[PDB]
Amino acid sequence: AGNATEVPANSTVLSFCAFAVDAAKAYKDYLASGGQPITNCVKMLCTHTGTGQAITVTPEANMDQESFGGASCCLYCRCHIDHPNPKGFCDLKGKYVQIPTTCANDPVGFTLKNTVCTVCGMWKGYGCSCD
Amino acid sequence: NVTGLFKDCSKVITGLHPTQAPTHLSVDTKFKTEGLCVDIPGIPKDMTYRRLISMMGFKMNYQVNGYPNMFITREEAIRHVRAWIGFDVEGCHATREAVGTNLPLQLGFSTGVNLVAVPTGYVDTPNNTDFSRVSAKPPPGDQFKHLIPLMYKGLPWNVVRIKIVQMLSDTLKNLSDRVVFVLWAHGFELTSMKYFVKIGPERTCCLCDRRATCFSTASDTYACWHHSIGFDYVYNPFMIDVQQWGFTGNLQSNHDLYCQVHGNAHVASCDAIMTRCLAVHECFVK
Ligand SMILES: O=C1C[C@@H](c2ccncc2)CN1
Ligand SMILES: O=C1C[C@H](c2ccncc2)CN1
């Protein structure tokens, strides 16, 4: 009974992060010890003529990015654990997230390490027009 | 190739919208094309779902620098026999809004303690994962009849985990710097540990040089067994599955080969007492 959501290549990393006091640190450490990044994300097919904004209602990848389903790029959603937000809600679930193509092999790791500019809506260091 | 870890146990026939699905497998078939997913204009997100996610199938076989192994060898377990706590969990089944997973109901320990939890699961919603009470029933059969009254005598998990930390601390503070849970067929015991165990690098207590055995979500601090009053999580426990030592039949038959003072009273604490007792006779007698 039920429907599988996961593949065996992700069992170890998701188990490790599901039990960690600090899941983001555990994921970073798992990668540094040679582990594979989380796979089975929701990658979208799009026209690559989007705005390039980081978090959007529909896919908005420009030619330097890929678009993903937002929950699938969130470590807390993938491990079914608490979000470190004040009210415990997610800012990626229910949106699409644009990830630089050079980082698209590890979308979960990308969202953990990076920040969206509140002024221009683009990732800091990967599109932000403010600095 | 799929795993049962994080299986969706809801009875909803369809999958999720691409923005809400945790994984490509979980996206509804309608969005899948050309090896990936597409957004379909006019097909909205679902804003009211509650999908129970199974915690059966954890695999603690990582090797990460600075994080200790949870499962230990027979040789390491023998050196830490004073840390041994037998542990067994009897579960109840998800029902009604979900089917296909086991929830912890009676948590038993070799100290003779049984703790009863409210049937609680991890329910994915449009905004987060809601750790909440779920519909459940004991498994059918005369061997599981004793679990029927326990369905309405459970305590909330925030209370149960404090009681587990207090019991372990009182039992072990003068015996060991750690705990070794002694298990028989560990899968469901490891799923139950998700509800009261946290892991990370080896740490020291917030009041001494002893290694940390407990963690508090109230202050994000660490404590040994002597300084853990009010702490809610067991931190970096160790464990061993005795069934993997070459036994063939059930727990009771192997336990009874060495011991006769522990009669089977069919309860989690009894199974936990038998598992520790069997391990003690196997490693230390004759
Ligand atoms: O097309 C589909 C996807 C499938 C599902 C898998 C995992 N979690 C939820 C749903 C059910 N229908
Ligand atoms: O020296 C001991 C062993 C004893 C014990 C019995 C069962 N489970 C755990 C511990 C308590 N004191």
Ligand SMILES: [Zn+2]
């Ligand atoms: Zn999330």
Ligand SMILES: [Zn+2]
């Ligand atoms: Zn900016």
Ligand SMILES: [Zn+2]
């Ligand atoms: Zn201490």
Ligand SMILES: [Zn+2]
């Ligand atoms: Zn015995």
